[PDB]
Amino acid sequence: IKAICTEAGMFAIREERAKVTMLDFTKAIEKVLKKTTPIPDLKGVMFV
Amino acid sequence: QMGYDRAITVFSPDGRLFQVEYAREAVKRGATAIGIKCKEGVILIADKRVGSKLLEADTIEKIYKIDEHICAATSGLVADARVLIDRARIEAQINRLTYDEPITVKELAKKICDFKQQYTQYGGVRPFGVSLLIAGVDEVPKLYETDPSGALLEYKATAIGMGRNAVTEFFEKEYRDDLSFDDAMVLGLVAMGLSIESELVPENIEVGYVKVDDRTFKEVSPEELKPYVERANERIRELLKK
Amino acid sequence: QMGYDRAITVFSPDGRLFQVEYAREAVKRGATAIGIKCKEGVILIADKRVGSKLLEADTIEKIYKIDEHICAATSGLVADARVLIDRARIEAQINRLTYDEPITVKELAKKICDFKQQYTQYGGVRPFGVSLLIAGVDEVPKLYETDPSGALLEYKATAIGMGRNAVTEFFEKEYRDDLSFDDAMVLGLVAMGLSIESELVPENIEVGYVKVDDRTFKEVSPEELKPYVERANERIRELLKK
Amino acid sequence: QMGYDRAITVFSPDGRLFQVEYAREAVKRGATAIGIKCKEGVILIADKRVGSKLLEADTIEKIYKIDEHICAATSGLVADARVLIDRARIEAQINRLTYDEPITVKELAKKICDFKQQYTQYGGVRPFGVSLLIAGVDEVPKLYETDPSGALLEYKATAIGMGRNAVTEFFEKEYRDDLSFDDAMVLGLVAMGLSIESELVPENIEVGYVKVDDRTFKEVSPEELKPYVERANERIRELLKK
Amino acid sequence: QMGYDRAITVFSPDGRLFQVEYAREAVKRGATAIGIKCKEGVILIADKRVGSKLLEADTIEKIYKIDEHICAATSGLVADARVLIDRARIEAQINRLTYDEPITVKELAKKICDFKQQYTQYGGVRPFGVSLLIAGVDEVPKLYETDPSGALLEYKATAIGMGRNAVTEFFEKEYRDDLSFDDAMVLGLVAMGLSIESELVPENIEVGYVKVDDRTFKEVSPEELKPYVERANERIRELLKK
Amino acid sequence: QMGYDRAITVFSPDGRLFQVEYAREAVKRGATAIGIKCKEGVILIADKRVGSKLLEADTIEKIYKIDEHICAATSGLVADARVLIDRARIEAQINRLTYDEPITVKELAKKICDFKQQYTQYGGVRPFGVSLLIAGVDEVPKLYETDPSGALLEYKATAIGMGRNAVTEFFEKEYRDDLSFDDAMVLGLVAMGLSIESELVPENIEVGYVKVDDRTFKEVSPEELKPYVERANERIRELLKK
Amino acid sequence: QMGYDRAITVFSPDGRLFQVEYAREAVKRGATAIGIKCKEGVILIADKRVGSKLLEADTIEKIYKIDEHICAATSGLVADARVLIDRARIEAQINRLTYDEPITVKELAKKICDFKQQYTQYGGVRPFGVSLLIAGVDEVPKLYETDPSGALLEYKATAIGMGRNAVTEFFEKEYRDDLSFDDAMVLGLVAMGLSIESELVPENIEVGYVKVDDRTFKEVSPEELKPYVERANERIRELLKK
Amino acid sequence: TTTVGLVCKDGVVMATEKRATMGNFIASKAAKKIYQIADRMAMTTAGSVGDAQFLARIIKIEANLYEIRRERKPTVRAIATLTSNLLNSYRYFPYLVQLLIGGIDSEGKSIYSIDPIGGAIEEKDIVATGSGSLTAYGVLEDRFTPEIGVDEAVELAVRAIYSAMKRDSASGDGIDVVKITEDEFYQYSPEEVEQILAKFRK
Amino acid sequence: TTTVGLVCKDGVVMATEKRATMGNFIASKAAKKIYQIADRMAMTTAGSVGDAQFLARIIKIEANLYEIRRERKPTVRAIATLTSNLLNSYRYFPYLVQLLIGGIDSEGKSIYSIDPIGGAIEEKDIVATGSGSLTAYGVLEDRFTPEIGVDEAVELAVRAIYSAMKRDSASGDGIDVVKITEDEFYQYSPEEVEQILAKFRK
């Protein structure tokens, strides 16, 4: 969680701000998920 | 757990069948299907939500005609449900053949539960990972939920699928026992709206029902969904802001 | 871990083969049913408390007609119950087809035990995880317990499921063979009361009886159960003070 | 480990069957039985003293009439007994169907074992962890014990169940082959008394016999049993003071 | 993940069958096959691309005819396709036996997904691991993807295979319900050429199509693909510069 | 890999059935069988050297007769070769029984693939560990390779077994369709030279071919082989000056 | 590689059946049998040597006639040979039943091999544990070796069992194609002596042969084994002096 | 032999003759042709005794099993159709029986006439069955009243059988009548029934 | 025992005479011999009541199974073939019956004649079938025009069978018309029919 917070603030810098918002958060989270998920929920198309 | 979940034959010292529960975790992957039973008819509302705009909306449905005054929904595998429910058609048919009396909704449920039950006992073949909602009206409305075991539970308001926990919470609060066909219909559109977590368009949902007077199955056209859906959207937006 | 409960074709070195005692643990987890034997009949009581107001307060059933002079009550999976209760009703009738004699409680009991043991013995199929109470009056009142093992145990009065131990203690003290139909009925309603650690209201229990002087099954009507319960609640309350 | 004991179609490196050796101990895990042969018939005595006042004194039973003039006791798992004795009885009348011959005691047990041979060889099915003692008079008295494996041993006096080891020792000094029917009947009881470690009450233990004058199965009700028991009870007292 | 993929009976804890998951990868390893349905018919195009000139001019066979106006094409395991398709032809002939009507694409699809479903239930037989796009014109054009799971899904333009993802993205922008017969089939060639990442020639694509206006299936010669291919190359080129 | 390969039933994360592809490794070890098509017939050349010289290696034999215009060569188990060829033989003669037509090259291949495949999907039985090339001229040259999977790939020249590697890499440069009957027979004989890495003797090799203008399988005697072998031996030696 | 060897439905990742490799080692824990082909017939010899004199070597057989012009020898389990030669006898004769023709050596070798392949498809049956050498004269002498794998190979001199290696090195030097009956016989005897590492005694060897000239099987008594065994034994002495 | 049935608004009233006469023969002193399927359901047969009795055991056994299954009383239709089907599946063992399976349920009162080729068909008025049926119709159709009770219905069931008996030699006596007034299952039994025709002769 | 059928221009009309008698029991005279397959599909029978209703019930059940499973109304040709294949199934015992299956479907109006053994052939607009077949063809075809409607088609149906009845004596009086216009599936029953032909015969 401490690394994700750090990713988000860094994301803000890339977006030319000092404001951290929800889209900065969502990418920051994904970066960490990339590592340790993906687990496919694409098998939900085979379930009614 | 650890080999006492890797065959269906097993038991656990918990006294669970973990294999059946995993079969029930299959029901919870698929989408919500919700039923209400009221004194003037029975209401069936299914998710028809498409993953894409290249997916055809016509069949991805849950709702199956079974009898003249019986429809049903399914949650679980698609594959399992159509084979299982084509069995419920046959069964309804057998009854009409040999007694010349259309199958009651209760008897039907006992028969198709026992069919799932040979597949739960047997080791050589898996159970289905499906629950049904079997809704019909025989003389007066009836609503049952079939478990993946084959357990049979009578209900008056029920859900299966992914959206289920919130729909359980919802019918605690909201549902009343003096409500009509029209009033309980809208409420089930607010409940489908809750579970999918948006204000419904009437082209990602499908309604079938059976009234006592009509004593028929009908399927609700897009033209005919809209007054319920518009009424719904008003109360659905309020729960997505509060 | 044990490795003696992978299949029912394994035995323990202990002699208490574990996989059918894990079919026993399945029963215990399930919710209660009590059989109480008197000299003027037998009385039989089972849960109907199940679920909240989503669920029916008229959930069918735990208190099965098997005959029009034999009843049965259950604990364990109501799925495993379903198929077994089906076989019971045909079997009982099968005695009738080939003799035109009412099957006695003892003879009915031995046949369901034999059915259970087909599934128990084969290793390519699991036992039923359900126990049965069979109550009738053939012309002497009789009460048996049939184990998920398909083993036969006779009792003066007995209970199964979560409340087994509370009732067990309850009848240990109080149960006599000199109880009348009224006395024994109210005593078993006290004992059911204790099992769920709560009062009894007439929709949480279904109660049936087989009378001596009629030898026919009749189910006590909801408002007809209300005066037994009314006197029972007094006592259940005294003991939940403790 | 050890075994090589999760399959019955696999022998241990000793060459033994762990699975059957294990199923032999389940006879022992269940209740005692005492069989005694004398020269004026054969008495089979079965333990029916079990559980508290919650059970009826009749607890089934444990001493089935197999044929007119042949009876058997059971020790071990009840479920397994129920089916074993079913086949036993049907085979006893089958001999009369094809030969019009009262089945020999000897042949009946050999075929009880032959059924059980099949469930020891074929891995598709469990062994029965149950042992019957087979007492009758074909025209001389004979006492056998049938085993889970299907091994077959003629005795002239025996115990099985809980008292198997204890009572073998009792009978090295005490038992002779010059005992009277009455003496024998009392001595099988002293030993039974030895097994539970307590005075016997005839109101919960069941005795049958086949004499050589009779050639018919008879059963001893508790009023009759009283003087036998009174001569046993002095000796059970003598034993439990040393 | 582990132990939930060693048979088709077992479910994993999320309610997913990991055996079944590996079966979608089975679809995705194999060659791309695209279907594009329009008002005037339904066109089914499948990759005929060969990794050698030592394979046949037409390698037999990527697009099967399975009834008068019903065709399917394959992706995934092409070994299983031979059996799957042997069956699909027979089922569509069968309905012509027993009602002497052209089978509808939907009911044909249901029946083949029952034949998968049959090998899914049994744990002795492993399931189909190939996906077919069954396309035909009945009352109106219809197009399905029948999955290894035994599920049908209807789409209005579709894909499966290697190229599966790329052609979902392409049609999301480019496909519309305003597309002519010609504008559609041509659009599938564009879809196919991106997929292989090469200009198309007639020997690396196989086309059939279904007309409404003829109400018959035809299989288009490599010669009469030549104009459409030419038209297609411009768009493919632009796409491969993007 | 592991665990996705010690059964037939298992799918791997790749989607492949490694079990079947390991029976293609059973083929792969021993020996060259070569097929080469041309526009004036099809020529099937096969290895026939087996062990040392005690072994008679002028018989046993890959080029089995199957019809009057159908022949197949084998690579892989000799054990599997006999039954599969025998079935093949059965299916050929079924077409004559029932249509009074010699069966077509395509259909025999199609069928015998389906037969191998049936056996792939069943568990507790394996697919055949042998591969054939199906050579025939119905009215047209065809050359097929039928796989131990039960898939069908038509080639215009291929090889299976040990020599597969050599003949592919050779046919990249050499193979063309401008070959005649003669140019193909010598050219496939060179192909086989490279595969065993030696000069040919017409003693250790055997050729059958199906010509369009005879419509016969004919089996070439070693005196007849020899002229063609002279043509080839000079080519094979220049190519083993690499 | 480890664990691709405990089923026969299972190929290993290296391509090879190691299960079969372990079935060819059972032959080699048997006693050698040598077959040698001459122009004047076919001679079959077998090691009747027995490890003691409490067994009677003469009766213990080794070498059985199969047809009136085909004989066969075994190596491996006695047990598996009994099923296999009973197969053989019935099959040889079945040819005579429906064609009235004494079975051809190739053809019997083939039909026994197809039997042995069938026990190698299914994992439910243990593959054979013997090999036969099939030697008769149909119209020409043939001398086959059948393999437990269910393969057949033509040989002109061969062995099976533990001596297989040594008889190969021996016949590699001294085997000729131009041998007479008397010379072949001698040569085979010499060779058996190398394998046992010691002299021959008439009383622990069996020799049976089928001449081309006569086409009747005849079996060599100890009396008539004598001339041949002096001449052979001098050579063994010399050869195993080195 | 001959059996009669009529549908009243107060019940269903049917009649049998227990004796089955070839033409002079006495099959049995008394036998059963009226089978009690429920207190509201009846089975009255004309045909063979043995097939009728055989089918009846099955049916009695399935009426009570069907009741326990729906937890709802058997309908008249549901027993009728079962017998049509039971006959056609088990026809491998020959059947020569006509059945009249009738009674009372929520829908009203009705009789279904079943022939051994199959069939179950709705009757709300008049039905008669057997070799005496042709004569029986003559009587029943002239004297039918729609508003008729069970009280005048017994008099008629008597009159109808009584004429078949006096003009068929193959029609035995021992006339039993069953009445199902929706309150009980009364059997008059032979002795009273014989006295109904005592006042129609003399 | 004779049946007729005609396509009008807008419905299918079939008619069946009630009077079936086997021995000394009249099976039909007040009970049906036409069964409902689907809403506007019927099947008419000439032959025994028992055979006709037992076989029709299966076809009726499977007609429902068709409708529901595939969401497609079955055609006259669909029901027709199915019936043919089932008459193949059992033919060990009596199962020889002459069926006419017709009505309205979503490809027009059709009648199909199903032979006793199996097989199905089509009839443009006139059928018969029965033993009155020869008399019926005349009456229907003379008064059949391409432009006849359902009202005057029901009148005709009665006229073909009642002119035929006279030459026959496997048939008697009592007749049912069925009219299938796609606005009603009405079963005329004896009362009504006797009254319409009371004006067209006297």
Asked if F114 has any chain E CB less than 8 Å from its own CB, the reply is yes
Which helix (H) or strand (E) element contains residue H2?
A: strand H2-7
Is H73 an 8 Å CB contact of chain C? no
CB proximity A44 to E under 8 Å: no
Judged by a CB distance cut-off of 8 A, whether residue A1 touches chain E is no
Beta-carbon separation of B81 and A48 below 8 A = yes
Position F23, amino acid: A
Write down which chains contact chain D via at least 3 CB pairs under 8 A: C
- Which helix (H) or strand (E) covers residue D46, if one does? strand D41-47
Residues of chain C contacting residue B147, judged by C-beta atoms under 8 Å apart: 79
Q: Residue G112 is encoded by which pair of tokens?
A: 């026994």
Contact between residue H148 and residue H9 where contact means Cβ atoms under 8 Å apart: yes
Instruction: Specify burial of residue D180 (Cβ count, 10 A radius: 0-12, 13-18, 19+).
Output: exposed
Task: Measure the CA–CA gap between B170 and B192, rounded to whole angstroms.
Answer: 11
Reduced 3-state DSSP string for F88-109: HHHHHHHHHHHCCCCCCHHHHH
Find all residues with CB under 8 Å of G93, minimum gap 6, and list them.
Answer: G67, G103
First-to-last alpha carbon distance for chain E, in angstroms, is 39
C-alpha closest to that of C130 among C77, C66, C51, C167: C77
Q: Which residues of chain A have a CB within 8 Å of the CB of B75?
A: 48
Contact F11 E28 (CB under 8 A): no
Picking from E145, E148, E172, E177, the residue whose alpha carbon sits closest to that of residue E159 is E145
Active site residues of I: 1
All residues at 6 or more sequence positions from G83 whose CB lies less than 8 Å from its CB, including other chains = none
Three-state secondary structure of chain F: CCCCCCCCCCCCCCCCCCCCCCCHHHHHCCCCEEEEEECCEEEEEEECCCCCCCECCCCCCCCEECCCCEEEEEEECHHHHHHHHHHHHHHHHHHHHHCCCCCCHHHHHHHHHHHHHHHHHECCECCCCEEEEEEEECCCEEEEEECCCCCEEEECEEEECCCHHHHHHHHCCCCCCCCCHHHHHHHHHHHHHHHHCCCCCCCCEEEEEEECCCCEEEEECHHHHHHHHHHHHHHHHHCCCC
**I69 contact E CB<8A:** yes
Q: Is F60 on the interface with E (CB under 8 A)?
A: no
Q: Do the Cβ atoms of B65 and I65 come within 8 Å?
A: no
Resolution of the coordinates, Å: 6.9
Task: Look up residue C28 and give its two tokens.
Answer: 């215990």
B205/chain A closest Cα distance in angstroms: 13
Q: How far is CA D174 from CA B101, D158, D191, I191, in A?
A: 74, 13, 10, 99
Largest distance between two CA atoms of chain A = 45
Buried b (16+ CB within 10 A) or exposed e, E98-126: ebbbbbbbbbbbbbbbebbbebbbbbbbb
Q: How far is H189 from chain I (nearest CA, A)?
A: 26
Q: Which residues 164-223 of D have a C-beta within 8 angstroms of C?
A: none
| H31: Cα within 13 Å, side-chain hemisphere | 20
Residues of B in contact with I61 (CB under 8 A): 93-94, 96-97
B100 contacts I71? CB cut-off 8 A: no
I and H touch with 3+ CB pairs <8 Å, answer yes
**Domains, chain I, ordered by start:** 1-202 (3.60.20.10)
What count of other Cβ atoms lies within 10 Å of the Cβ of residue H29?
8
Nearest Cβ partner for B97 among I58, I68, I71: I58
Q: How far apart are CA C126 and CA B8, in angstroms?
A: 8
Residue C219 distance to chain B (closest CA, Å): 19
**Beta carbons of I94 and H115 less than 8 Å apart:** no
Q: Which amino acid is at I174?
A: G
Residue (of G68, G40, G217, G35) closest to G140 by Cα position: G40
Tokens 């199909």 correspond to: I112
B chain contacts of residue C60, beta-carbon cutoff 8 Å: 106, 154
DSSP A48: -
C-beta separation of I101 from I76 below 8 A? yes
The H or E element spanning position I87 is helix I76-89
Whether a cis peptide bond, with omega within 30° of 0, leads into A38 is yes
Place of tokens 């898996």: B126
Whether F189 contacts F167, CB under 8 Å? no
Q: Which of A43, A44, A48 sits opposite B76 (nearest CB)?
A: A48
Question: SS3 of E131, please?
Answer: strand
Q: Residue B79 to residues E36, E75, I84: CA-CA distances in angstroms?
A: 24, 19, 32
Taking contacts as CB-CB distances below 8 angstroms, the residues of chain I near B93 are: 61-62, 64-65
Q: Which amino acid is at C19?
A: Q
Q: Are I86 and I50 in contact (CB under 8 A)?
A: no
A40 in contact with chain B, both atoms CB, cutoff 8 A: no
Please state, in angstroms and rounded to a whole number, the distance separating the CA atoms of residues B11 and C19: 6
Phi, psi values for residue H166, rounded to 5°: -95, 15
Q: Do I53 and H115 make contact, defined as CB atoms within 8 angstroms?
A: no
- Residue D104 is classified by DSSP as P
Report the C-alpha gap between E108 and E105 in whole angstroms: 5
Q: Do chains A and B touch (3 or more CB pairs under 8 A)?
A: yes
Residue I144 CA: distances (Å) to CA of C96, E178, G156, I2: 61, 49, 91, 19
Which chain H residue lies closest to I28 (C-alpha atoms)?
H121
How far apart CA E10 and CA B19 sit, in angstroms, is 7
Rounded Cα distance between C166 and C190, Å, is: 11
> C96 to chain H nearest CA, in Å?
7
d(CA C75, CA G6): 44
> How wide is the angle at C-alpha F49 spanned by C-alphas F45 and F55, nearest 5°?
145
Q: Specify the 3-state DSSP secondary structure of E162.
A: coil
Written in H, E and C, the secondary structure of F165-208 is: HHHHHHHCCCCCCCCCHHHHHHHHHHHHHHHHCCCCCCCCEEEE
Which of C84, C86, C103, C85 minimizes the C-alpha distance to C94?
A: C103
Q: E57: closest CA among E206, E188, E227, E193?
A: E206
Is residue G134 a contact partner of residue G91, using CB atoms and an 8 Å limit? no
Which residues, other chains included, contact E188 with Cβ-Cβ below 8 Å and sequence gap of 6+?
E34, E35, E36, E43, E45
Alpha-carbon gap: E215 to the closest alpha carbon of chain B (Å): 22
Residue G147's closest CA among G27, G14, G1, G9?
A: G27
